[PDB]
């Protein structure tokens, strides 16, 4: 399967705003988890949230929501009240879990938090 | 918290039929996985069978294809084993689990006796 | 149908101790491995899953490692708690499959 989409490429809020992506997944199956990252400094990619959610990790950062659209292949994924430290680099990745496991990321996408 | 709890098991004759059942609370049970393991006595783990979320991605393993049926019914956070034909080498405990990157969520087990 | 062979089948190892099991698969399943402690008369628990993720909850002393087909998994200093059996499995493709198993014992 194609690895999810990511889109825009560039995403420019006021701090304060919200500020959404979205991560496009042709799903063939019902069996797959889109998770979104933030990169960091050290090129380390940092979980901000996930579809369906993982459910040993209760109590999470509101901050980043996940909502699915109708069509079932396109997912908001919204930094609310977005701060000037959110500016960076974004991306989401699609997790299959069966019949076949196996990770796929989207291309990268930077935000971009103004005063 | 997440809780799985399985009900069922019992002893059986060769060639006879029992159905379990599971119910599940703590999670949205149709954005999830599900599947059964078993144990039979001093021996390791067996996967058995699983069925997707919506219910559509439905697999079994080789050793109960066409006699054992898994199944789910999303508005009651319900999940189904329906073994039919059972032989003595299925006798073991069955857990009901839920999956994720791996199995992260284990029912304690019921146990099946298949014996004459 | 991918087989998954784990060693040693057991293993006697004292409180404190840095103890590694292994687990490799007949052919390649990329990091998608798991592993579980098992204790007499309860359910499995999740520890590890693709490979090196420590799940939520497990203590961190345990860690993972490997890929392709050979795995690995090392308590860093054995606690009382920690005496069990582990299993590791593939969920890299159906079927799943798990080894058959460690025994941590205590030596004496």
């Known amino acids: 399967w194609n690895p999810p989409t990511f889109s825009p490429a560039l995403l420019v809020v006021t701090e304060g705003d919200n500020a959404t992506f979205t991560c496009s997944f042709s799903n063939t199956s019902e069996s797959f988890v889109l998770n979104w990252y933030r990169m960091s400094p050290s090129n380390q990619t940092d979980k901000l949230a996930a579809f369906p959610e993982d459910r040993s990790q209760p109590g999470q950062d509101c901050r980043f929501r996940v909502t699915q659209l109708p069509n079932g292949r396109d997912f908001h994924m919204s930094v609310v009240r977005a701060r000037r430290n959110d500016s960076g680099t974004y991306l989401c990745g699609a997790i299959s879990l069966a019949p076949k496991a196996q990770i796929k990321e989207s291309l990268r996408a930077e935000l971009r938090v103004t005063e | 918290q997440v809780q799985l709890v399985e009900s069922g098991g019992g002893l059986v004759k060769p060639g006879g039929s029992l159905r379990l059942s599971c119910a599940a609370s703590?999670?949205?049970?149709?954005?999830?996985?599900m599947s059964w393991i078993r144990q039979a006595p001093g021996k390791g783990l067996e996967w058995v069978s699983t069925?997707?979320?919506?219910?559509?991605?439905?697999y079994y393993a080789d050793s109960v294809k066409g006699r054992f049926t898994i199944s789910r019914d999303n508005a009651k956070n319900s999940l189904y084993l329906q073994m039919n034909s059972l032989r003595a080498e299925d006798t073991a405990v069955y857990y009901c689990?839920?999956?994720?990157?791996?199995?992260?969520?284990w029912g304690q087990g019921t146990s099946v006796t298949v014996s004459s | 149908d991918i087989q998954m062979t784990q060693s040693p089948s057991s293993l006697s190892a004292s409180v404190g101790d840095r103890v590694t099991i292994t687990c490799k698969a007949s052919?390649?399943?990329?990091?998608?491995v798991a592993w579980y402690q098992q204790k007499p008369g309860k359910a499995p628990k999740l520890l590890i899953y693709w490979a090196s993720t420590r799940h939520t909850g497990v203590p961190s002393r345990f860690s993972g490692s490997g890929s392709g087909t050979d795995f690995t998994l090392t308590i860093s200093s054995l606690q009382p708690e920690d005496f069990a059996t582990y299993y590791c499995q593939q969920h890299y493709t159906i079927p799943w499959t798990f080894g058959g198993g460690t025994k941590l014992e205590i030596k004496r």
């Open positions: 052919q390649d399943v990329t990091t998608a």
């Open positions: 703590g999670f949205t049970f149709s954005n999830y996985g």
């Open positions: 069925i997707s979320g919506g219910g559509s991605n439905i």
């Open positions: 689990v839920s999956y994720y990157y791996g199995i992260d969520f």
